[model samples]
Target chain A: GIVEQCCTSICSLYQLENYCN
Target chain B: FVNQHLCGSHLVEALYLVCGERGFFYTPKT
Candidate 1:
């Protein structure tokens, strides 16, 4: 859960946008 | 080791570039 949140909020914008759908 | 690293880097770059072409901008920490 934390990892997902971290990725969603803290990852590079490009990465989050690309991976999160 | 070098080849694997290069391959991985290339894959990430390709994805980044592809997304860039799709108008995804990179936001980095300053």
Candidate 2:
């Protein structure tokens, strides 16, 4: 979850990432 | 109270930096 990835900043917004599966 | 109509650009920045992966972030096409 990019939301979890960018938790600090995105929490202030509402956020993502890609490629890896 | 949080200013809804103010349209905080700061939030856009935060999403760009953190969520955008600076550039490589593949987002959905508009």
Candidate 3:
């Protein structure tokens, strides 16, 4: 469990690396 | 884990049925 926040919008590094798979 | 998806030729083509890390808030295993 490890998550930091702050993503208003810039997602798409290949779908956010497949949304952080 | 997208519908009967998983290389099923486009997530079974019904709009990504389920799999957002079980949606426990996100990233549980996506």
**Tens-digit per-residue lDDT, B1-30, candidate 3:** 211212222322222233344322234223
lDDT tens readout by residue for model 1, B1-30: 011121323434534544564554333334
Off by over 4 Å in 3: A1-7, A13-15, B1-25, B28-30
Better DockQ candidate (1, 3): 1
How far residue B17's Cα lies from its native spot in candidate 2, in Å, is 0.7
TM-score of chain B of each: 0.37, 0.38, 0.14
lDDT by residue for model 2 (B1-30), tens:
121221245434544554554454433224
Off by over 4 Å in 2: A1-21, B1-7, B21-30
At residue A4, what lDDT does model 3 achieve?
20
- In lDDT terms, which candidate is top? 1
Question: Model 2: chain B TM-score vs. truth?
Answer: 0.38
lDDT of 3 by residue, A1-21 (tens): 111221332222223234332
Could you tell me the TM-score of candidate 1? 0.27
Q: Sorted by TM-score, highest first, which candidate order results?
A: 2, 1, 3
